[PDB]
Amino acid sequence: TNGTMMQYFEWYLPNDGNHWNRLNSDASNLKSKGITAVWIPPAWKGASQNDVGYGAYDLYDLGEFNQKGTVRTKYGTRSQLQAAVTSLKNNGIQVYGDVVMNHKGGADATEMVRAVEVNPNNRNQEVTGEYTIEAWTRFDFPGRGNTHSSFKWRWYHFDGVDWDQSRRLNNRIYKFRGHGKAWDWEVDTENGNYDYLMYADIDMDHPEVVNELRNWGVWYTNTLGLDGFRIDAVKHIKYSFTRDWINHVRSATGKNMFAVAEFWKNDLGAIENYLQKTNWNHSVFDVPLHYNLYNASKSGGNYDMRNIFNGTVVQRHPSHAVTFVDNHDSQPEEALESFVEEWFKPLAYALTLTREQGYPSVFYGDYYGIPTHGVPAMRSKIDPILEARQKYAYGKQNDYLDHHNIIGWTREGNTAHPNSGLATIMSDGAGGSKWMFVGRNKAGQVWSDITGNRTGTVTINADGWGNFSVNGGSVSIWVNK
Ligand SMILES: C[C@H]1O[C@H](O[C@H]2[C@H](O)[C@@H](O)[C@@H](O[C@H]3[C@H](O)[C@@H](O)[C@H](O)O[C@@H]3CO)O[C@@H]2CO)[C@H](O)[C@@H](O)[C@@H]1N[C@H]1C=C(CO)[C@@H](O[C@H]2O[C@H](CO)[C@@H](O[C@H]3O[C@H](CO)[C@@H](O[C@H]4O[C@H](CO)[C@@H](O[C@H]5O[C@H](C)[C@@H](N[C@H]6C=C(CO)[C@@H](O)[C@H](O)[C@H]6O)[C@H](O)[C@H]5O)[C@H](O)[C@H]4O)[C@H](O)[C@H]3O)[C@H](O)[C@H]2O)[C@H](O)[C@H]1O
Ligand SMILES: OC[C@H]1O[C@H](O[C@H]2[C@H](O)[C@@H](O)[C@@H](O)O[C@@H]2CO)[C@H](O)[C@@H](O)[C@@H]1O
Ligand SMILES: OC[C@H]1O[C@H](O[C@H]2[C@H](O)[C@@H](O)[C@@H](O)O[C@@H]2CO)[C@H](O)[C@@H](O)[C@@H]1O
Ligand SMILES: [Ca+2]
Ligand SMILES: [Ca+2]
Numbered sequence: 001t002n003g004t005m006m007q008y009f010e011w012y013l014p015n016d017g018n019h020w021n022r023l024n025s026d027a028s029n030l031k032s033k034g035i036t037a038v039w040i041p042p043a044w045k046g047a048s049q050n051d052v053g054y055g056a057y058d059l060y061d062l063g064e065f066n067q068k069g070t071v072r073t074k075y076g077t078r079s080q081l082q083a084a085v086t087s088l089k090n091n092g093i094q095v096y097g098d099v100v101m102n103h104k105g106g107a108d109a110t111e112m113v114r115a116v117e118v119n120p121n122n123r124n125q126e127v128t129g130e131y132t133i134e135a136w137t138r139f140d141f142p143g144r145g146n147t148h149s150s151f152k153w154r155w156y157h158f159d160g161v162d163w164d165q166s167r168r169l170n171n172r173i174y175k176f177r178g179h180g181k182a183w184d185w186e187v188d189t190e191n192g193n194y195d196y197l198m199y200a201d202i203d204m205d206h207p208e209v210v211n212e213l214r215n216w217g218v219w220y221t222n223t224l225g226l227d228g229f230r231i232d233a234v235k236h237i238k239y240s241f242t243r244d245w246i247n248h249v250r251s252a253t254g255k256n257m258f259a260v261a262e263f264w265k266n267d268l269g270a271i272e273n274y275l276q277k278t279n280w281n282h283s284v285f286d287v288p289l290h291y292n293l294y295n296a297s298k299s300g301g302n303y304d305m306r307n308i309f310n311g312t313v314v315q316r317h318p319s320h321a322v323t324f325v326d327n328h329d330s331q332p333e334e335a336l337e338s339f340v341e342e343w344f345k346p347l348a349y350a351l352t353l354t355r356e357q358g359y360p361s362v363f364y365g366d367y368y369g370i371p372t373h374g375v376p377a378m379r380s381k382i383d384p385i386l387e388a389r390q391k392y393a394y395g396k397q398n399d400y401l402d403h404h405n406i407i408g409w410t411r412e413g414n415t416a417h418p419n420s421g422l423a424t425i426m427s428d429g430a431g432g433s434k435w436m437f438v439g440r441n442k443a444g445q446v447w448s449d450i451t452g453n454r455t456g457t458v459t460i461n462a463d464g465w466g467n468f469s470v471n472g473g474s475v476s477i478w479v480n481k
């Protein structure tokens with residue numbers, strides 16, 4: 001019954017065009033381990049073959065056309081992708097496609113555009129008069145032609161860029177001039193107006209653009225048979241646009257598409273604003289939780305575990321939180337590097353997978369490892385936790401986040417799941433024990449640690465209490481197995 005999604009990719013995967021095939025053959029395995037949904041990497045053609053996909057060139061080229069010097073994307077061909085999706089569907093796994101609508105990179109040609117420079121630290125302040133720049137805003141898709149879509153992009157479909165091919169100046173942000181041209185609103189306010197991020201910034205004020213992206217969303221959904229979306233860089237996209245784009249796609253497909261937005265800011269208030277402005281119609285990644293987990297793993301035991309959920313989305317708005325430990329941006333060497341340390345990682349996964357609130361996600365990089373950066377596969381430590389979530393994490397939850405090192409919580413289980421119920425106990429410091437209530441109906445049961453970290457057993461007393469133990473800097477998940 002408990003759902004668990006998996007980000008099926010990491011930044012440094014090899015550019016071998018065999019990822020779709022890997023996913024294909026891993027389908028049955030994932031389902032057996034408790035994975036119920038998979039978030040696939042960008043499926044379209046990037047600025048180059050080895051682009052992870054965020055340098056989004058052509059959203060209609062899913063590794064089907066000869067563009068950018070390659071037919072396949074970094075992950076494989078459209079055929080292989082569709083074969084992987086079918087495999088997932090046949091194994092009862094939902095498929096969430098990534099969605100990049102903030103910008104377009106790898107333009108086919110440049111155009112002469114009138115623009116003014118703006119202050120990178122306050123995009124609402126123009127710092128130069130108007131003049132002509134050479135911007136990469138033209139997309140004709142020579143390898144695709146009009147297949148799937150005849151829509152062509154020009155400078156007027158964008159709000160600006162950060163590169164003038166005619167002068168090649170650094171640290172500049174250009175806001176295009178013209179009828180109705182201005183940064184979109186509402187967007188995040190860091191830097192005054194955070195509409196601009198990278199590449200050619202799409203203008204959500206243009207009717208042709210809104211119409212086109214909505215039509216693409218429908219095409220994308222119907223073509224692959226997607227069950228949901230992972231929406232990229234939403235704090236840089238007109239809030240109402242994303243809200244209405246999701247509503248449009250759900251309506252046009254007659255499907256209640258799941259959606260998780262990436263609003264990257266360690267600030268609950270900003271995320272709450274985003275949720276209210278989008279009418280709570282979709283979920284968001286719990287970025288604050290990720291930082292709490294990260295900071296805890298870097299505090300050498302001095303983090304106050306009692307506050308592990310303070311300021312998080314899962315604590316405040318559990319129904320709209322997608323909890324994750326790490327991702328492709330937080331992994332080593334990447335843009336948002338803040339990788340949760342290996343010793344703490346099992347605790348982090350226990351914190352997201354065994355509690356009743358939030359929609360947890362497993363990171364491919366953590367599960368299978370990141371060989372390029374020395375990160376070992378941790379599936380051996382994650383699998384026992386996934387099994388705990390699948391079979392035992394059910395029923396009423398009792399919290400015991402009452403100590404700076406040792407915290408824990410129990411689940412009383414429900415009749416819908418046999419022998420369900422559990423007692424998670426962890427310590428970011430010295431080991432110990434904690435008495436916790438698991439339910440009077442469990443009296444006499446002899447519980448054991450599904451993680452295997454502790455080898456003994458814990459007998460629930462006549463009143464439903466068990467004295468659970470945990471080793472130092474570790475987590476134990478006691479269950480009636
Ligand atoms: C990654 C993350 O970033 C953002 O997060 C911010 C955050 O907003 C900010 O607040 C802060 O975060 C703090 C929090 O607020 C705090 O609360 C917390 O406590 O601390 C935080 C840490 O400070 O900082 C964060 C990081 O900055 C954003 O909000 C997140 O959403 C975002 N994560 C998601 C979003 C992504 C965007 O899709 C995605 O990013 C990925 O992938 C990106 C794309 O690869 C990558 O971007 C980087 O690399 C780009 C490519 O190098 C670079 O682009 C520039 O350079 C290009 C040239 O290479 C330019 O292109 C143009 O010029 C070229 C020449 C043209 N090419 C021509 C020429 C040719 C030569 O002959 C031809 O061959 C070609 O065919 C032609 O086309 C091209 O067409 C032109 O367009 C381009 O204009 C330049 O912008 C980017 O600038 C650079 O950033 C990211 O690194 C990577 O992470 C995330 O993965 C996704 O999860
Ligand atoms: O004269 C150039 C012209 O460019 C833009 O007009 C675009 C318009 O935005 C598109 O929707 C489409 O209709 O193509 C037009 C160009 O033929 C500017 O918006 C406009 O102000 C400008 O005059
Ligand atoms: O739709 C407006 C709605 O917003 C709030 O309700 C949120 C709630 O705060 C979230 O935690 C979650 O439960 O989603 C709800 C929206 O479905 C307000 O609390 C509510 O009064 C208001 O109607
Ligand atoms: Ca605009
Ligand atoms: Ca934008």
Ligand SMILES: [Ca+2]
Nearest residue numbers: 301303404405
């Ligand atoms: Ca501590």
Ligand code: NA
Nearest residue numbers: 159184202203
């Ligand atoms: Na814009």
